[PDB]
Write a protein that binds this ligand. Sequence first.
Ligand SMILES: C=C1CC[C@@]2(C(C)C)C[C@@H]12
Length: 515
Amino acid sequence: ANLWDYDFLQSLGRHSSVTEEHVGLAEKLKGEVKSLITGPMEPLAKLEFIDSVRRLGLKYQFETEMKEALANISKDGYDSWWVDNLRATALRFRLLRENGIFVPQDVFERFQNKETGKFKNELCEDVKGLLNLYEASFLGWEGEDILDEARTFSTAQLKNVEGKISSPNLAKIVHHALDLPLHWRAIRYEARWFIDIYEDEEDMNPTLLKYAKLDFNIVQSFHQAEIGRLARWWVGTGLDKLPFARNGLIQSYMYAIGMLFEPHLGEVREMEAKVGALITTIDDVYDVYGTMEELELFTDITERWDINRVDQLPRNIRMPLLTMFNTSNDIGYWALKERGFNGIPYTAKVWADQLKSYTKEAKWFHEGHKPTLEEYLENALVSIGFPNLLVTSYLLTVDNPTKEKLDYVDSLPLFVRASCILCRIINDLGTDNLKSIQCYMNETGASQEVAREHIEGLVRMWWKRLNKCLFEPSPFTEPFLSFTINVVRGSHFFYQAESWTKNQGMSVLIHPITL
Ligand SMILES: C=C1CC[C@@]2(C(C)C)C[C@@H]12
């Protein structure tokens, strides 16, 4: 049991402690959870149950029932159960907005002083109210000034009352929230954390908890089989023996699990994990290893999709190039075989764009250029690799793929571009004139502190644009809508170190939950 050892990883999938007993039991428990979601409950208890299902990582199992239950609740007429109750108002606001039912920000106006616009100090003691208002504030859109205030008020008040909480479970939950709000957390990682928290909750439903543990283990069995296949592939490429990208395959796979964890998306997840491993490896080629002539040739070969000159590159560069080429061809071919559409033009194109973006960064560094923040981000939203990963994910999943459809996604419309910019700025915040904070410092003369606060403000702004894009009609469908949001959550989760990562990998991918 070592997450960084390829002998161990290549053995995964061979055995699993998940039995067909476990699977029949999961089918019976699923039917009872489904019935609990659709069945009688008081509305606040129903909101709390639905929120728990999501946090345990099970929305993917009960999407239709959860939407059906919230739709019934939203069209009630009776509102005494929530009106004048901050906790209930805030939970309802968030769950309805998460599930495509609009609630206006003015539901919070009654909790503000009419003269200052400030939240009332009498709320400064209601911990679960404050917590629900904090988590709700992240579902806000641009110009929803009450929700911007709700965030700053609830953050300040929670920081002040965290140490006054009596319930150890509630204290842990509030600490967790102040680190990252639930809206920004990666689903699969939050599910493993929350299974242990939920077990200790007063209101805990034992049927739901048992289902959550069983489903967690069943899903984890698919992940172990994928890791096995990917580790055997990676060792096959020989890139594991290369002087750089230490732990690139398993780091990529852990990122991919943030993007998409469901078993039915296993083949797509494996291909996203391959691309991510290659991105990390080639990033090091362009950053540390290659000479400018080597990198110009790598870029030209990729732009032309023409490997005639590849033997001019040294072995440690030639092997990443040809693995990128071969895997891009394999992924485009999977689209032809499985989806009826040859994807090679699109995998080749996004790799050429990505290497051009690396080449521009390398030229800026070589020539001592200081780009503006805007000039930097225009290139760095491509260099982060998410146009590559997201266009690929759309290629593999869209119904009735066409050149028109792939050309639109590849043009990075606002919804997609917002996700790519977020992933770049979150990475950059997770730590040189070529990173977000330093560019803004060069452009404005701001301090590190002030430049960091500006870039944090850009994270909040681009989230508000994503949030609103999801209430708008879209040419996109599931699962691509979810991928776009979930790559950002993956970025937040991994850019908040080697023991923390290993713990996440071992607890989510390697060790089953004890039943
Ligand atoms: C630069 C990045 C951000 C995305 C990435 C992951 C998939 C390992 C390739 C690395």
